[PDB]
Design a protein around this ligand. Structure first.
Ligand SMILES: [Ca+2]
Ligand SMILES: [Ca+2]
Length: 312
């Protein structure tokens, strides 16, 4: 497998568990620090990063009834400049740029208690596909599916339903949606970290997935595996292989990586393209920092880059 070694430029530092890199509708850059703790208790943060200086600003330190959150993944909304944040303790949050936030669900569409989430991905229809590797949200005692298969997948629909679409994953992590050239969502990719697998489903409609299949194989026997992911404009899937020092690049058909990207650190966690560029921002847990490097082409447009009232 060919390996490239692009130049990684430092963006910002000292962000505990640096995760969920995302750009909003105005081009502002955000990062979440899920692993910030105060007195051994969760005190996760959502930060805005000044790309010119690398200076950090904590806009939100989510907590519900005294229970601090562990914000781990993000997706920018299209119709409003707000961020949908996957939280390991609080579930799904909607965070405004002013720092205020709301907890979306304590229970799913079936009345079952919500599970802590890690990452999410918007399809072009506005439905949010979410990975939930943690156990029940606060006030329940914190648990995570790294050893046992109790991780779930949800789909938060346009009509406000939090639907559990699958279960029994050993730490479902990164998640991505593949679209047809006409914009129709048709395939969901889900990373299962410790098992070194990428799973796929056919998206038949909002909150309707079928035919679970082992889509790709993550290299290595190191502790860790696939974390965050995103598609480039040609539908190649870039996946952060936490613990391997590489970001794997899968072709449209999956299977084995067709290329690897060597990182100057062992724990790449998540990544995100800056709109209209080849620049990929990468968070990593060796130094707990954020970097950026140039990919071969532009990223696949995120839902927030599409237009509700577009014509073409
Ligand atoms: Ca993650
Ligand atoms: Ca991303």
């Amino acid at each position: 497998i060919p390996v490239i070694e692009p130049l990684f430029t430092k963006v910002t530092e000292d962000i505990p568990g640096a995760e969920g890199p995302v750009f909003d509708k105005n081009g502002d850059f955000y990062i979440v620090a899920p692993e910030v703790e105060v007195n051994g208790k969760p005190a996760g943060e959502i930060l805005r990063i000044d790309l010119k200086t690398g200076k950090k600003t904590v806009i939100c330190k989510p907590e519900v009834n005294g229970y601090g959150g562990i914000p781990a993944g993000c997706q920018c909304d299209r119709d409003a400049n707000q961020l949908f944040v996957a939280d390991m303790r609080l579930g799904l949050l909607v965070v405004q740029t002013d720092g205020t936030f709301e907890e979306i669900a304590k229970k799913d569409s079936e009345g079952r208690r919500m599970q802590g989430c890690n990452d999410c991905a918007f399809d072009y229809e506005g439905n949010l596909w979410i990975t939930a590797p943690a156990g029940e949200v606060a006030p329940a005692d914190y648990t995570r599916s790294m050893q046992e298969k109790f991780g779930s997948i949800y789909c938060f629909t346009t009509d406000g339903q939090m639907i559990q679409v699958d279960t029994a994953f050993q730490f479902p992590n990164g998640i991505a949606v593949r679209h047809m050239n006409d914009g129709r969502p048709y395939q969901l990719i889900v990373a299962e970290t410790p098992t070194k697998k990428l799973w796929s489903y056919d998206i038949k409609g909002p909150a309707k997935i079928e035919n679970k299949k082992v889509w790709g194989h993550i290299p290595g026997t190191h502790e860790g595996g696939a974390d965050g992911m995103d598609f480039d404009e040609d539908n190649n899937l870039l996946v952060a292989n936490w613990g391997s020092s590489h970001i794997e690049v899968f072709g449209p058909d999956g299977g084995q990586p067709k290329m690897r990207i060597r990182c100057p650190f062992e724990k790449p966690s998540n990544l995100h393209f800056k709109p209209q560029t080849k620049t990929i921002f990468v968070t990593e847990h060796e130094n707990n920092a954020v970097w950026k490097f140039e990919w071969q082409r532009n990223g696949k447009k995120q839902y927030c880059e599409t237009l509700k009232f577009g014509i073409f």
